[PDB]
């Protein structure tokens, strides 16, 4: 299967209340492996998964150095963007940043990305070819010109296409008994009568990894989001994910309804039907 290494950064200003909050998290697929939080005690990059805990003082010292450089860049960014948009000192504002690379089945490079938002919307993003920028407004154009003048795309691209992929492969290899496995969803259906003319069917998927899943209800093989109820995929808290989808049906007609499950850990899509 295909894989990803993604880093997520959040910086929040604190009017009248000093230094901004800064949180950094790294992921292989849907597995968190490092974090940094400016509110935490260590003031170092910390491990969050067993396989990364075997890297030496070199890895940790350097990752700490570089995560502090991100923090300082973001510290300057909040001042700059307050200037660009002439916002008062009174409000809290938020910067977010995501970058990463994807590889295919062979672990060869597939795509890379770098996105930056202010106050919850797109500010500037690297395009597909990793050679140029998309800027959302006149303030972000200022940034784009500065980042073209510094040939930022070029060195960012060197990281996304080389370094990112090279370290992803190593993390895959070191943590293989927990990154390289797909956990097939455990499925069951519940039936709960609501009256004498209606029942609820609920389709369950539990203990699956990765988080990407599709649960669809069909009636005689025809799509059915009339009177579906679908929750957002949610974390169990042990590394696996959960999700359900529910439909309310005429009594005596249970057997017209099928629940379809698509997941990477399944060799083929499941069908489930209520058998009494």
């Amino acid at each position: 299967g295909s894989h990803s290494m993604r880093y997520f950064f959040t910086s929040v200003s604190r009017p009248g209340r000093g230094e901004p909050r800064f949180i950094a998290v790294g992921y292989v697929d849907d597995t968190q492996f490092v974090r940094f939080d400016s509110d935490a005690a260590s003031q170092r990059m910390e491990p969050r998964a067993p396989w990364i805990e075997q890297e030496g003082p070199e890895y940790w010292d350097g990752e700490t150095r570089k995560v502090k450089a991100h923090s300082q860049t973001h510290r300057v960014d909040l001042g700059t963007l307050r200037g660009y948009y002439n916002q008062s000192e009174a409000g809290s504002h938020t910067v977010q940043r995501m970058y990463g690379c994807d590889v295919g089945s062979d672990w060869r490079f597939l795509r890379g990305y770098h996105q930056y938002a202010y106050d919850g919307k797109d500010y500037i993003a690297l395009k597909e070819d990793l050679r140029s920028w998309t800027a959302a407004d006149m303030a972000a154009q200022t940034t784009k010109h500065k980042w073209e003048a510094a040939h930022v795309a070029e060195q960012l691209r060197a990281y996304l296409e080389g370094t990112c992929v090279e370290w992803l492969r190593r993390y895959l290899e070191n943590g293989k008994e927990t990154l390289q496995r797909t956990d097939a969803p455990k499925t069951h259906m519940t039936h709960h009568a609501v009256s004498d003319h209606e029942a609820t069917l609920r389709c369950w998927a539990l203990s699956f990894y990765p988080a990407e899943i599709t649960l669809t209800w069909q009636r005689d093989g025809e799509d059915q989001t009339q009177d579906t109820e679908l929750v957002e995929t949610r974390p169990a808290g042990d590394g696996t994910f959960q999700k359900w989808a529910a439909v309310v049906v005429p009594s005596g007609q249970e057997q017209r309804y099928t629940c379809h499950v698509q997941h990477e850990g399944l060799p083929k899509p499941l069908t489930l039907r209520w058998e009494p």
Binding site: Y7, K66, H70, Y99, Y123, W147, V152
Partner: peptide, 9 residues
Amino acid sequence: LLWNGPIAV
């Protein structure tokens, strides 16, 4: 492994 190259806006 982090990117070493982030630049101010």
